[PDB]
Amino acid sequence: EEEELEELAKELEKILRDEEGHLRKLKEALAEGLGDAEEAAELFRAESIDEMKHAEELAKLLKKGGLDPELRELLEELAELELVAINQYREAAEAAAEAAENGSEEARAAAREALEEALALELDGAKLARAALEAVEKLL
């Protein structure tokens, strides 16, 4: 029982580190304004694939048995948070792609709102991965 929790705790550690990374790169784009719209559009598309990997690992562990009821709910909440983040990453990438081709002032503000909304979802993603890793550490 201990070594299936250890591997699981290794997973939240990777997810937690990846979330803390996306946090900083997102404010960096926020600091640079739009900068190169292609920069943000290429960055969003890559990080949505990162959240892709996270939700897939969690679902495989969610199919496992013997999980503590409270631990399963935190993983279920995180997996839900990942799918909504993959959404907002796509809405922000398309708004940055429309701003790159057009120079549109509306596609600019729309890419910034979707950037800011993706940032708020990333704060709670790291917070949920922190609380989940803390619960597993208590079980160990």
Author numbering: 1 to 140
Q: What do the authors report?
A:
We describe deep learning approaches for scaffolding such functional sites without needing to pre-specify the fold or secondary structure of the scaffold. We use the methods to design candidate immunogens, receptor traps, metalloproteins, enzymes, and protein-binding proteins, and validate the designs using a combination of in silico and experimental tests.
In the training of recent versions of RosettaFold, a subset of positions in the input multiple sequence alignment (MSA) are masked and the network is trained to recover this missing sequence information in addition to predicting structure. Di-iron sites are important in biological systems for iron storage and can mediate catalysis. We were able to recapitulate the di-iron site from E. coli bacterioferritin, composed of four parallel helical segments, to sub-angstrom AF-RMSD using both inpainting and hallucination (the latter were not tested due to buried polar residues). The designs had diverse helix connectivities and low structural similarity to the parent (TM-score 0.55–0.71 to 1BCF_A). We chose 96 inpainted designs to test experimentally, and found that 76 had soluble expression, at least 8 had a spectroscopic shift indicative of Co2+-binding (a proxy for iron binding), and 3 (dife_inp_1–3) had CD spectra consistent with the designed fold and were stabilized by metal binding.
